[PDB]
Design an enzyme around this catalytic site. Structure first.
Site, PDB file in Angstrom:
ATOM      1  N   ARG A 182     -26.948  15.886  88.375  1.00  0.00           N
ATOM      2  CA  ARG A 182     -26.806  16.950  87.389  1.00  0.00           C
ATOM      3  C   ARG A 182     -28.136  17.169  86.678  1.00  0.00           C
ATOM      4  O   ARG A 182     -28.950  16.249  86.548  1.00  0.00           O
ATOM      5  CB  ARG A 182     -25.695  16.607  86.377  1.00  0.00           C
ATOM      6  CG  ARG A 182     -25.687  17.428  85.089  1.00  0.00           C
ATOM      7  CD  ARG A 182     -24.664  16.890  84.099  1.00  0.00           C
ATOM      8  NE  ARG A 182     -25.061  17.110  82.711  1.00  0.00           N
ATOM      9  CZ  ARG A 182     -24.355  16.714  81.656  1.00  0.00           C
ATOM     10  NH1 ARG A 182     -23.203  16.079  81.820  1.00  0.00           N
ATOM     11  NH2 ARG A 182     -24.795  16.959  80.431  1.00  0.00           N
TER      12      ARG A 182
ATOM     13  N   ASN B 149     -14.174  16.835  75.145  1.00  0.00           N
ATOM     14  CA  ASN B 149     -14.781  17.822  76.034  1.00  0.00           C
ATOM     15  C   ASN B 149     -14.611  17.438  77.498  1.00  0.00           C
ATOM     16  O   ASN B 149     -14.252  18.277  78.331  1.00  0.00           O
ATOM     17  CB  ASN B 149     -16.263  17.994  75.715  1.00  0.00           C
ATOM     18  CG  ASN B 149     -16.917  19.059  76.571  1.00  0.00           C
ATOM     19  OD1 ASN B 149     -16.383  20.155  76.736  1.00  0.00           O
ATOM     20  ND2 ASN B 149     -18.056  18.723  77.163  1.00  0.00           N
TER      21      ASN B 149
ATOM     22  N   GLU C 158     -23.899   4.332  78.695  1.00  0.00           N
ATOM     23  CA  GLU C 158     -24.382   4.017  80.033  1.00  0.00           C
ATOM     24  C   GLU C 158     -25.369   2.862  80.005  1.00  0.00           C
ATOM     25  O   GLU C 158     -25.509   2.141  80.999  1.00  0.00           O
ATOM     26  CB  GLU C 158     -24.994   5.258  80.674  1.00  0.00           C
ATOM     27  CG  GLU C 158     -23.994   6.384  80.864  1.00  0.00           C
ATOM     28  CD  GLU C 158     -23.924   7.321  79.671  1.00  0.00           C
ATOM     29  OE1 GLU C 158     -23.505   8.486  79.849  1.00  0.00           O
ATOM     30  OE2 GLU C 158     -24.295   6.897  78.557  1.00  0.00           O
TER      31      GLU C 158
ATOM     32  N   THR D 170     -19.691  14.376  82.618  1.00  0.00           N
ATOM     33  CA  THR D 170     -19.548  15.434  83.610  1.00  0.00           C
ATOM     34  C   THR D 170     -20.817  15.503  84.457  1.00  0.00           C
ATOM     35  O   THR D 170     -21.921  15.356  83.925  1.00  0.00           O
ATOM     36  CB  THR D 170     -19.352  16.771  82.894  1.00  0.00           C
ATOM     37  OG1 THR D 170     -18.414  16.605  81.825  1.00  0.00           O
ATOM     38  CG2 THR D 170     -18.838  17.837  83.848  1.00  0.00           C
TER      39      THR D 170
HETATM   40  C1  LIG Z   1     -21.127  17.888  76.861  1.00  0.00           C
HETATM   41  C2  LIG Z   1     -21.380  16.580  77.555  1.00  0.00           C
HETATM   42  O1  LIG Z   1     -22.167  16.519  78.510  1.00  0.00           O
HETATM   43  C3  LIG Z   1     -20.649  15.358  77.050  1.00  0.00           C
HETATM   44  S1  LIG Z   1     -19.539  15.516  75.675  1.00  0.00           S
HETATM   45  C4  LIG Z   1     -19.154  13.756  75.745  1.00  0.00           C
HETATM   46  C5  LIG Z   1     -18.181  13.095  74.785  1.00  0.00           C
HETATM   47  C6  LIG Z   1     -17.704  14.002  73.615  1.00  0.00           C
HETATM   48  O2  LIG Z   1     -16.685  13.256  72.935  1.00  0.00           O
HETATM   49  P1  LIG Z   1     -16.745  13.208  71.364  1.00  0.00           P
HETATM   50  O3  LIG Z   1     -15.557  12.474  70.830  1.00  0.00           O
HETATM   51  O4  LIG Z   1     -18.006  12.502  70.936  1.00  0.00           O
HETATM   52  O5  LIG Z   1     -16.745  14.705  70.823  1.00  0.00           O
HETATM   53  P2  LIG Z   1     -15.565  15.736  71.118  1.00  0.00           P
HETATM   54  O6  LIG Z   1     -15.856  16.476  72.407  1.00  0.00           O
HETATM   55  O7  LIG Z   1     -15.464  16.723  69.989  1.00  0.00           O
HETATM   56  O8  LIG Z   1     -14.273  14.977  71.271  1.00  0.00           O
HETATM   57  C7  LIG Z   1     -19.854  13.175  76.753  1.00  0.00           C
HETATM   58  C8  LIG Z   1     -19.764  11.722  77.094  1.00  0.00           C
HETATM   59  N1  LIG Z   1     -20.691  14.068  77.464  1.00  0.00           N
HETATM   60  C9  LIG Z   1     -21.453  13.543  78.549  1.00  0.00           C
HETATM   61  C10 LIG Z   1     -22.751  12.753  78.099  1.00  0.00           C
HETATM   62  C11 LIG Z   1     -22.886  11.356  78.357  1.00  0.00           C
HETATM   63  N2  LIG Z   1     -23.987  10.709  77.971  1.00  0.00           N
HETATM   64  C12 LIG Z   1     -24.964  11.352  77.353  1.00  0.00           C
HETATM   65  C13 LIG Z   1     -26.218  10.572  76.928  1.00  0.00           C
HETATM   66  N3  LIG Z   1     -24.897  12.651  77.087  1.00  0.00           N
HETATM   67  C14 LIG Z   1     -23.817  13.380  77.435  1.00  0.00           C
HETATM   68  N4  LIG Z   1     -23.781  14.777  77.136  1.00  0.00           N
END
Ligand SMILES: CC(=O)c1sc(CCOP(=O)(O)OP(=O)(O)O)c(C)[n+]1Cc1cnc(C)nc1N
Ligand SMILES: CC(=O)c1sc(CCOP(=O)(O)OP(=O)(O)O)c(C)[n+]1Cc1cnc(C)nc1N
Ligand code: SF4
Ligand code: SF4
Ligand code: SF4
Ligand SMILES: [Mg+2]
Ligand SMILES: [Mg+2]
Lengths: 1165, 501, 167
Positions: free
Chosen positions: A111, A999, A61, A28
């Protein structure tokens, strides 16, 4: 042509046309860019090369950046989309891509970076952290500019060989919907330098003309070789200028490296970048027309910074400049753009006073009133430097004073605000309304949407604008011509009518008649309605949807009511566009559903009634406020104003300097958003406590009490005698929390009694009764019970330490974590990965983790997405060090003149400090003797005892828990998780496997099964699910277990207790149903039972301790499935939407489940 | 006592004393710091807490950074050693550590970043890439300064709650062997703010007094919450200043946030950072003795940048300033230190002509002859800006011309070069000879060793110096009093007798 | 493998008598698997551009012997031996076919000639040490293996970090 898009779609539109490969990873607010690019490839959209874009999703990334580099070095034009923490992981590869002069474009939805706290919202912190990589940087200020400058970036990078970062403000531009001129792909290809593309192909790695790149260099040639790329950077500014002229001739819209706007003889000029330029130009027009000599310089090409192109647009009359940076570099002399402006003016001997400020961090509002404050600061005798705008900094006194409020909106612009409920259709309808007006009128249209941190039942505020002039108002609506409230519960809760224009429109959805308006509306609201002479309209959309058969969907109904009164277009034309859009939306639906939505439009027009209020409403007086309850200072000063939508008013002195928050604050929310709540039938209840076990919000719990403690109980607090030898002579009752329940219906589904002991009843009918019941149960004294915590019934008598989170109704993740706090919450520390579990677990200012009566509870911390395993690993090392420091001080006490009873507990603690029960037993013995032993000592003996007392919080052994999602465990953090498991440390890893990135909307992962359709996998995933549990078993000393609460309660209990007691690494992979699967959350528990019974999800336990006992470590807890595999897949939308090619993928999924079961049978043999 | 150490050992000496946990991952030239810290723990060396340091190796520097954050948040004083590409992978966690105000010291052997090519050699490219993380940044210019300022950082970070990056030039200082005054562990503990350590323990994550940290915040409170740390950064310069006086009272060596050297009426002043300060001061001594009005400002505390402490040591007679950065930011208007110097002088209305240059990328030589060229450019009618020194840039014409070759080595300093063969014992023998002279005479001793890219059979060139005065010659030997050739094959192959006196 | 394989100014990788040989590239330590993965995607993209121009040649007025080799290559572009066999047939007929063509036919043949270096199927090799494969790049190596791409990963397992002294 004109279309209504957002910045993300505008960027992806250009990026798709110019690229062959796109390696992506979701984050996001940049993930919409990659989502729409994947769908276009799935439908066969062609780029300028006549092919579809090849989209490859990586594990992080970092992996994406490496793939970009390799794809470029091998001869393919490649782009990517990322932001914030994702851009940080690409920085190492960006140095290489820039160093090797590879043409490339990164599209960044700028962001904030995670510092003292995470923020998914927009500022330039991420882009500024890469300003030294050698990439060029191009800024877009509006959705139209995203379209144009993305083309400028893609065209310039081929000519200059310098890769570009094209960035735009996260949310403020990436999610702002605007009607813009979209550039046709055919027109772009006429501007591409095809000679430059072919030259890029010859530089590719190829065995028929080989070369070596990326060598290692000694000091003799490294300096010179780095300076050999200087001519390419010297020519880049001029190349962008010529490319900008190419786009100008095509579109008519003129861009320059730096653009000027304002009075030609201006004396005060603001230099800025991004969407702030729109707000500043709008304000500059207002001030210049009023005669003030002010101006604005928009920075487009930030790097390379061309002094020639900047000074060319600086009027000679400029005496004072204020530079605004959308970032913060703590301790730095100034922010990046301020340091550049100050430098260039010094290099040319310009005597211009320069001043820098910070604004809009994490999407902080930046409106024209603030812009004038920046301009007013330049007009002061001594302008304040290093300032802030948009906050009240009462600590360091850097904030500028917002003196007066001005309205710089161009005349003729319509402004509307829409207060909606989570997923009630309001936001979607407004998006449709913007597309209607933009496609059928000459008016410009703008839409911006404010969302809530609460996932279900949250407040959404839509900001829409339409006008005959271009809309530069990149800020929230200040003075609204129309305000609509789609939820009557907001009436009296939020300041809906704030800033509404005199004579404006107020549209309300309610069942209240004109006479009930006197008693239902608050006095302050009635005063505003009468004094401002508002046209008050009402509609009972819920009654209409019930009578038509649409249920409670009111999106179509309220949209019709809007066009009827807004007078933006002819009412007759609006009705046609709505019904025409209904065919486009409900055309694939049945013929019965189509005519229902048509009836919604027809019945809504006749049901909309204007409320003629008496003029005496202006004199109405507020009712006497009740005696406010004494709440904690944090709740009183922080949580309440934030939830009242007034957080922007809190000054700097409100917050801790390190982003630390108290625990147990969600119990003060009491949102009361449920439509139905469980009513307990005492005669049908078998006292099994499974309803408290499966509740995703801990809103239903069992309560025990001695009959003497039920003295002042209300008459409705019906109880029953407690079953069991442990609870002999006690009373039992299953009580629900009405204001915290979500209405999900899981507890009614799991109740296994002959006659259902739980039935869903509407909240309003039983709200008054159940409130007094819960308030009495909460005041019950603690009850010592000897029930075995290893059972399902016995475990639920312990207080849950995770309650009332922001997860969705019926979430499949929170029941797992709630169970852990009931077993070990007294002594555990949580390292939680970024994701849903961190959003409902740790969104300020509310904390769902709470404490028991002794004040003890889980300590919760989240670092980053990729480092969660190592984050908890470091905690384990530190906790071991803190226990080692205590054990040294206790061993010295043995040689000290202390009581014999003190020595007995100390020696007992030293012998069992590594056992949970023994350390608590002897630890509590030491705690009881500490106050008296210190009183009996003096001198050095007292100091030795005072050092033990300082460390008494480490007597009880801690239990480190590493909680995270499947995207963390299977992808970005797998390399770190693999390392923590191999180390052998006493850590507990809990993987909440939702098979998607839940999320961010539900994107593809390595945990996704074959054939499942999610974002980034429009055509379905071909490769099978990666077996994380099998790889952790290869070490042999890692405890691995696969659990599913809905399938077997006893199997989950055995694995969790065995994993925690195991003195080593433990891995718990739990299946967590989620809304992204496309199922009814009412039967979330039933969906997990069908998953295991159909062979879709295995249940096993790998116990290394069984290997030390000479037994087989692998135990298969469910060997023979009894349900049909294909029938389970058809019950979830995430598989039915694929249907074709689906039958080919379904066959592979069933064969893999038999081979996986046969593989587990061979290991069990 | 006096010992002959290198920059790595000097840093690890202090880091071992002041830390409980050290999570490490190998990367040249910082890996020797973690290597010697592992050997000390295996032999039972005690820190100031009476225990051995616990060393944990991760799978990458990213894993190391995450472990540091967890160890700090859980209540253990933790450090780490890294450089170059390793420092980049730690940057995401550095934002969290600085934002949460956790005391910490990263020791960095500053090394070039991989761009058009990899380079294991030293410059400030890695440290500059983290200047916006909120970490403090402290630069030491010599092996003796590594010892002292590493203590300064460890003492200041506990008091200021702002984490520190203590960095020194890779190879040029990390592998430079010098006889230095070693600070005893017992003397450090007399300067530690123990009240700060106990306060740091109370903030730790613990289930008996739980809290939440690292939340997610909406636009309503994020901006304010980020500015709530403003007082901690405003007070950090004064804390570093007071800590530097504590070390001054103990050792007799006086450091300031910015140090001045040269003529008090100087008109041309070079501002620099790291090991270049030694070469510049050696040159400044030579030029001031020759009557030239030149000076030098050494930057010690780069972040947070205290304008008050910089202007206090800037002579009022200064008319022209040349800023030297040991990094390159392509396309930028100027390099980081040049942009800072240009800003602060502009904010105070100083009519001082400022010019920036680049030097020493990837351990490029930076000797006194080049320093005079930088001073000579300031004396020209129109000084060249955005220049380079140490190369011949015939493409973009940014290089300064090395007009004449000068010898600024203090009189009485002996200089020896040893041309050896790969792994024949020459380097090890020269190291032993330096230890011999350093332990048994009043002379300062210096040793620097040039290696080859070939793993077997390469040429090694040792540069040794001894003198009665401190050795500031952080550059290869120009005029050698003795040259030894341990391989007859070099005769007729290399210019062995080059520059021999 | 990158120090002895790619330290300037000496390159140990050489060419054969025809002038063809391995192209060598090093990005970073942690991204080597994904680095080669991106190369595989690009070469696949480059072969599609050539195969598209060849399919247009089937409908063009060219010699039957030229068409015979093109049909054989299109059927075997994914086989190492067959792509080299028919690819060299295309190379032998290219100079004479351009001489016998004019107008758009010559431009279509010149587009085949511009991309003739992608007729022979390539072999992507991902080379690295045990420290890359077991530690820093394992997460990326895990992903590239799971993708199923036709890449060849060669792990030179020395059981230590040999270059940096043996860690
Ligand atoms: C909050 C945010 O910015 C999130 S939550 C999420 C994936 C969550 O999926 P997961 O399966 O691991 O857990 P779940 O939500 O319970 O299904 C990402 C990629 N991001 C973006 C992101 C990308 N890359 C990094 C280093 N940090 C973040 N926060
Ligand atoms: C050159 C350099 O800086 C090397 S070579 C190397 C390990 C090589 O061991 P491996 O087993 O993978 O291969 P081998 O040499 O053949 O044994 C490291 C950690 N480093 C330091 C390092 C650390 N971290 C990062 C991101 N990049 C580098 N280059
Ligand atoms: S309906 Fe859902 S939220 Fe409400 S008590 Fe039952 S399980 Fe909990
Ligand atoms: S699930 Fe039903 S039977 Fe079991 S405790 Fe709850 S209400 Fe009683
Ligand atoms: S995991 Fe799914 S159900 Fe749970 S909070 Fe996240 S999106 Fe909602
Ligand atoms: Mg998930
Ligand atoms: Mg190895």
């Amino acid at each position: 042509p004109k279309q209504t898009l957002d910045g993300n779609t505008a960027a992806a539109h250009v990026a798709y046309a110019m690229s062959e490969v796109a390696t992506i990873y979701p984050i996001t607010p940049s993930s919409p860019m990659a989502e729409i690019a994947d769908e276009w490839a799935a439908h066969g959209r062609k780029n300028i090369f006549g092919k579809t874009l090849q989209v490859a999703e990586m594990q992080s990334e970092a992996g994406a950046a490496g793939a970009v580099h390799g794809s470029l070095a091998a001869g393919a034009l490649t782009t990517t989309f990322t932001a914030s923490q994702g851009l940080l992981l690409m920085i190492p590869n960006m140095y290489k891509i820039a160093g090797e002069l590879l043409p490339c474009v990164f599209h960044v939805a700028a962001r904030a970076l995670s510092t003292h706290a995470l923020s998914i919202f927009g500022d330039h912190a991420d882009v500024m952290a890469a300003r030294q990589t050698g990439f060029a940087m191009l800024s877009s200020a509006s959705v139209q500019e995203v379209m144009d400058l993305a083309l400028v970036a893609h065209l310039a990078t081929l000519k200059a060989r310098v890769p570009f970062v094209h960035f735009f403000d996260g949310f403020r531009t990436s999610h702002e919907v605007q009607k813009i001129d979209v550039i046709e792909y055919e027109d772009m290809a006429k501007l591409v330098d095809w000679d430059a593309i072919r030259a890029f192909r010859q530089r590719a790695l190829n065995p028929e003309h080989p070369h070596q790149r990326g060598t290692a260099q000694n000091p003799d040639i490294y300096f010179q070789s780095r300076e050999a790329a200087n001519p390419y950077y010297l020519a880049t500014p001029g190349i962008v200028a010529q490319v900008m002229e190419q786009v100008a001739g095509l579109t008519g819209r003129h861009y320059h490296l730096f653009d000027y706007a304002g009075a030609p003889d201006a004396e005060r000029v603001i230099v800025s970048m991004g969407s702030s330029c729109e707000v500043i130009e709008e304000t500059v027009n207002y001030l210049v027309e009023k005669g003030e000599k002010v101006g604005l310089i928009k920075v487009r090409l930030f790097r390379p910074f061309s002094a020639e192109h900047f000074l060319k647009v600086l009027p000679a009359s400029v005496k004072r400049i204020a530079v605004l940076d959308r970032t913060k570099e703590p301790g730095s002399l100034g922010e990046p753009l301020y340091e550049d402006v100050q430098t260039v003016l010094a290099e040319h001997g310009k005597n211009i006073l320069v001043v820098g400020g910070r604004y809009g961090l994490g999407s902080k509002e930046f409106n024209p009133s603030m812009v004038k404050a920046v301009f007013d600061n330049l007009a002061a005798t001594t302008p304040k430097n290093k300032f802030t705008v948009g906050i009240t900094d009462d600590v360091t006194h850097t904030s500028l004073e917002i003196k007066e409020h001005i309205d710089t909106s161009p005349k003729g612009t319509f402004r509307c605000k829409f207060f909606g409920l989570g997923s009630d259709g309001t936001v979607g309808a407004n998006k449709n309304s913007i597309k209607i007006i933009g496609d059928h009128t000459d008016m410009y249209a703008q839409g911006y949407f404010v969302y809530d941190s609460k996932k279900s039942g949250g407040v959404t505020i839509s900001h829409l604008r339409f006008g005959k002039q271009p809309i530069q108002s990149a800020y929230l609506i200040d003075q609204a011509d129309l305000i609509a409230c789609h939820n009557p519960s907001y009436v009296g809760r939020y300041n809906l009518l704030e800033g509404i224009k005199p004579g404006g429109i107020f549209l309300l959805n309610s069942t209240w008649s004109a006479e009930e308006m006197d008693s239902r509306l608050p006095a302050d609201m009635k005063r505003t309605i009468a004094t401002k002479k508002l046209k008050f309209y009402n509609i009972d959309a819920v009654k209409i949807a019930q009578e038509i058969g649409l249920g409670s969907r009111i999106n179509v109904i309220m949209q019709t009511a809007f066009f009827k009164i807004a007078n933006v277009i002819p009412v007759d034309e609006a009705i046609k566009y709505i019904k025409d859009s209904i065919v486009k939306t409900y055309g694939k639906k049945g013929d019965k559903i189509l005519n229902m939505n048509f009836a919604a439009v027809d019945r809504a027009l006749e049901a909309l009634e204007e409320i003629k209020y008496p003029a005496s409403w202006a004199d109405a007086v507020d009712e006497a406020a009740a005696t406010v309850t004494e709440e904690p200072e944090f709740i009183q000063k922080v949580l309440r104003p934030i939830n009242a939508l007034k957080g922007d008013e809190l000054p700097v002195s409100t917050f801790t300097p390190d982003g630390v928050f108290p625990v147990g604050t969600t119990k003060y929310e009491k949102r009361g958003i449920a439509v139905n709540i469980p009513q307990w039938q005492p005669e049908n209840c078998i006292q099994c406590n499974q309803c408290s076990l499966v509740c995703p919000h801990a809103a239903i719990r069992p309560y025990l009490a001695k009959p003497a403690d039920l003295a002042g109980a209300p008459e409705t607090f019906v109880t029953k005698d407690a079953i069991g030898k442990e609870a002999a002579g006690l009373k039992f009752r299953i009580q629900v929390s009405p204001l915290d329940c979500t209405g999900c219906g899981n507890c009614a589904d799991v109740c296994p009694a002959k006659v259902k002991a739980l039935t869903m009843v509407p909240l309003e009918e039983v709200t008054a009764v159940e409130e007094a019941n819960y308030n009495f149960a909460e005041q019950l004294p603690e009850v010592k019970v000897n029930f075995n915590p290893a059972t399902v019934k016995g475990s639920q008598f312990r207080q849950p330490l995770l309650e009332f989170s922001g997860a969705c109704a019926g979430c499949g993740e929170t029941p797992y974590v709630k169970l852990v706090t009931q077993l070990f919450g007294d002594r555990m520390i949580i390292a939680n990965a970024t994701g849903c579990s961190s959003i409902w677990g740790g969104s300020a200012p509310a904390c769902p983790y709470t404490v028991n009566r002794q004040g003890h509870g889980p300590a919760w911390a989240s670092s980053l997405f990729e480092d969660n395993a190592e984050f908890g690993y470091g905690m384990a090392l530190a906790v071991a060090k803190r226990q080692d420091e205590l054990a040294t001080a206790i061993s010295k006490a043995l040689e000290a003149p202390v009581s014999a009873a003190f020595k007995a507990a100390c020696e007992g603690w030293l012998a069992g400090k590594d056992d949970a029960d023994r350390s608590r037993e002897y630890g509590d013995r030491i705690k009881a003797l500490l106050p008296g032993e210190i009183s009996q000592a003096s001198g050095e003996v007292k100091d030795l005892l005072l050092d033990i007392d300082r460390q008494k919080d480490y007597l009880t052994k801690k239990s480190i828990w590493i909680i995270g999602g499947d995207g963390w465990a299977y992808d970005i953090g797998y390399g770190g998780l693999d390392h923590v498991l191999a180390s052998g440390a006493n850590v507990n890893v809990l993987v909440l496997d939702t098979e998607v990135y839940s999320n961010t909307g539900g994107q593809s992962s390595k945990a996704t099964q074959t054939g499942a359709v999610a974002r980034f996998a429009a055509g379905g995933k071909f490769t099978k699910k990666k077996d994380l549990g099998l790889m952790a078993m290869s070490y042999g000393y890692v405890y691995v277990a696969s659990v599913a609460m809905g399938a077997s309660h006893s199997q989950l209990m055995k694995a969790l207790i065995e994993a925690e007691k195991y003195d080593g690494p433990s891995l718990i992979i739990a299946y967590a149903p989620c809304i992204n699967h496309g199922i009814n959350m009412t039967y979330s528990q039933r969906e997990a039972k069908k998953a295991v019974e159909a062979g879709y999800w295995p249940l096993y336990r790998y116990n290394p301790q069984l290997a030390q006992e000479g037994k087989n470590p692998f135990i298969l807890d469910y060997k023979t499935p009894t349900a049909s595999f294909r029938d389970f897949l058809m019950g979830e939308i995430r598989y039915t939407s694929l249907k074709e090619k689906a039958e080919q993928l379904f066959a592979k999924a069933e064969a893999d489940a038999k081979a996986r079961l046969e593989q587990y049978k061979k290991l069990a043999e």
